[PDB]
Amino acid sequence: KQTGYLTIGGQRYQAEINDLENLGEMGGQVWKMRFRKTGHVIAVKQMRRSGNKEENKRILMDLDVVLKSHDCPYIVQCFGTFITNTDVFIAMELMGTCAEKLKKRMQGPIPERILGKMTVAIVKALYYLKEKHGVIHRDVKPSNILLDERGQIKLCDFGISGDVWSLGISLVELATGQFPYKNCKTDFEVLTKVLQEEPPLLPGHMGFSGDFQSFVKDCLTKDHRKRPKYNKLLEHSFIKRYETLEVDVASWFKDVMAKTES
Numbered sequence: 001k002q003t004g005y006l007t008i009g010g011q012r013y014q015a016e017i018n019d020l021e022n023l024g025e026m027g028g029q030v031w032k033m034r035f036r037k038t039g040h041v042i043a044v045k046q047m048r049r050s051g052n053k054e055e056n057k058r059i060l061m062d063l064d065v066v067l068k069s070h071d072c073p074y075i076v077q078c079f080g081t082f083i084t085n086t087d088v089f090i091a092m093e094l095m096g097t098c099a100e101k102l103k104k105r106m107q108g109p110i111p112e113r114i115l116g117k118m119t120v121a122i123v124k125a126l127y128y129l130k131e132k133h134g135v136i137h138r139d140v141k142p143s144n145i146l147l148d149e150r151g152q153i154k155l156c157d158f159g160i161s162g163d164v165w166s167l168g169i170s171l172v173e174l175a176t177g178q179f180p181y182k183n184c185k186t187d188f189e190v191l192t193k194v195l196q197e198e199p200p201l202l203p204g205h206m207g208f209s210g211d212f213q214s215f216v217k218d219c220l221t222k223d224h225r226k227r228p229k230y231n232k233l234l235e236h237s238f239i240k241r242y243e244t245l246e247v248d249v250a251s252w253f254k255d256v257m258a259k260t261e262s
Contacts, residue, residue: 001067005080006091008040017082017089020044028055028158032094042079043092050086061161063090068133069160074125076146076154092157096149096257099142103174105260110174112212116242117249118145118153118174119215122167123239125155127230140166142174149257151250164227168219172200175208175216211238 006015013019013035021034023041031044047059069075079091099118103110122145129135137144139159146154173179180200184190199220202213215238221227233239 002080003083006035006040006042007079008035008038008042011038013037015080015082015091017084017087020089028059030092033091041094043094045090045092047088047090048086049088058159059090062157062159065129065133065135065160066092066157069128072125072128072132073152074121074128074154075160076157093154094148095146095152095154096253097147098156099145099147099170099174101143101262102147102256103142103177105256105262106177107260108177109206110177111252112175112208113247114249114252115171115174116212116238116245117151117247118147119167119171120239120242121153122155123230123233126163126167127234129155129160130230135160136162138162140170142170145170147249147253149250149254151248151253153249164219164230164233168216169200171216171219172202175202175212176206209238209241211236211241214238 004015006013015035015037019036020042021036022044023032023034026032026043029046029048031046032041033044034041045059047056063078063081066075066078070077076093076095079093081091082089097105099110122140126137126140129137137155137160140163144156144158146156148154169180181190181193184193199217199222201220202208202216204213215233215236218228218233218236
């Protein structure tokens with residue numbers, strides 16, 4: 001298909017691995033690279049033909065989904081691929097940070113303003129995944145939510161091929177700056193807390209809108225059978241509010257990344 005091409009914006013370039021400058025690792029081996037022939041800076045996943053066959057199956061499934069999702073603006077886009085005898089390089093849209101690294105930098109709550117726009121983008125991405133490819137995600141975390149300096153929020157291409165309840169937990173973590181289950185010393189203890197304890201709802205003493213508290217309360221319905229599908233979350237007043245409301249995400253993001261490090 002598209003291999004040996006980078007397709008950035010509208011343009012298309014005859015490309016090759018030598019036509020890229022490696023600017024260093026970002027965080028699974030994903031590089032920050034410069035396309036020499038334009039100066040375009042991009043993200044590059046290297047898949048080593050000699051790697052864990054399980055990492056590589058995971059990367060190929062995840063890429064399959066991204067290539068299918070060219071039309072969804074809430075999912076990081078593929079620019080193209082290079083295949084050599086030893087490696088596949090996967091050119092991805094470069095984003096500024098993930099929500100986890102963004103929380104660590106903030107060292108406190110993220111404003112409801114920001115998390116509204118993020119809930120819209122993520123719910124829509126997950127709806128697009130189920131609706132149009134019958135993909136469930138089964139790994140919704142702050143580390144899988146990506147932001148860029150132009151205010152775009154997108155769902156990250158990791159286990160993008162395998163719910164509501166994790167979006168809830170992700171939103172409480174970022175709203176408050178605290179993981180609800182940060183005291184649990186094992187994974188089984190977390191699950192024990194999920195089943196046995198009241199859902200970890202937003203507190204009422206941080207000036208969160210009733211809409212935001214309702215959306216999370218909904219997401220953290222303890223009975224599987226009474227939790228709403230996406231069809232119904234997209235109709236929640238919280239989403240509707242932040243679909244239309246202009247929020248300067250781009251400015252807020254720049255302020256945070258400038259006034260903090262790693």
